[PDB]
Prior knowledge:
binds quinazoline-2,4-diamine; globular; alpha/beta; about 160 residues; 4 helices; DHFR_CS; Dihydrofolate Reductase, subunit A; binds NADPH dihydro-nicotinamide-adenine-dinucleotide phosphate; about 35% strand; eight-stranded mixed beta sheet; binds calcium ion
Amino acid sequence: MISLIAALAVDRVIGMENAMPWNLPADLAWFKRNTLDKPVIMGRHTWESIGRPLPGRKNIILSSQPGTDDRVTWVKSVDEAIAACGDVPEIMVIGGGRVYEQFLPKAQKLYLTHIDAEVEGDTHFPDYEPDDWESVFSEFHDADAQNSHSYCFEILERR
Ligand SMILES: NC(=O)C1=CN([C@@H]2O[C@H](COP(=O)(O)OP(=O)(O)OC[C@H]3O[C@@H](n4cnc5c(N)ncnc54)[C@H](OP(=O)(O)O)[C@@H]3O)[C@@H](O)[C@H]2O)C=CC1
Ligand SMILES: Nc1nc(N)c2ccccc2n1
Ligand SMILES: [Ca+2]
Ligand SMILES: [Ca+2]
Ligand SMILES: [Ca+2]
Ligand SMILES: [Ca+2]
Ligand SMILES: [Ca+2]
Ligand SMILES: [Ca+2]
Ligand SMILES: [Ca+2]
C-alpha cells in the first residue's frame, strides 16, 4: 500500500528553490507521526533539501545515477523503490513534485496539509482528480504563536 504525504500551500505550491517556504512545527509533528517506523521514498532533490537521513525510517532515494551516501538506500526506478521497502503495511512517498507525479497513480492514500499561505513556488503537488478521492479525516487549525498560518490536516482514500 502506497501513500503520498505532502504539505500544500495555495495553488498546490509545495516548494521554492529546494525549500518549503513556511514554518509550521505542527506540520513537522504530523509528518513525523504519520511516517515514523514506515519506509520513506524520496527524490534526490528532496534528499538534498532535507539534508540528512530521517531517523526511525528506512530512507529510499530515487536517482538515475549511483548513490552518494550508504546511510540510505538508493534506487533507479519506481518499481525498484517499492521493492526495496519489502513486505510492509504502508510505504510513505515524501516528495518531491516529480516523485509525487509518478507515485500518484499507484497511491491508495493521501496525507495532505492544506496550508493557508501565499507562496511563489517552482514546485507543485500533482493536480489530483477530486472525484477519485474521498476525505476520511479532516482537522482544521487556526494559526497560533508557533504556526503563522491556519492549516488543515486531511486524509484522502482512493474511492
Ligand atoms: N511541501 C512538501 O510536502 C514537500 C516539498 N518538497 C519540495 O519539492 C521540491 C523537490 O521536488 P522536485 O524538484 O520535483 O525533485 P524530487 O525531490 O521529486 O527529485 C527528483 C529527482 O529524483 C530522481 N527521480 C525521480 N523519479 C525517478 C525515477 N523514476 N527513476 C530514477 N530517478 C528518479 C531524479 O534524480 P536524478 O536527477 O539523480 O536522476 C530526479 O531528478 C523541493 O522544493 C522540496 O522543498 C519536497 C518534499 C515535500
Ligand atoms: N506534510 C509533510 N509532508 C512531507 N512530505 C514533508 C517532507 C519533509 C519535512 C516536512 C513535510 N511535511
Ligand atoms: Ca523562510
Ligand atoms: Ca537530473
Ligand atoms: Ca559496505
Ligand atoms: Ca520545478
Ligand atoms: Ca475537475
Ligand atoms: Ca511560524
Ligand atoms: Ca471505494
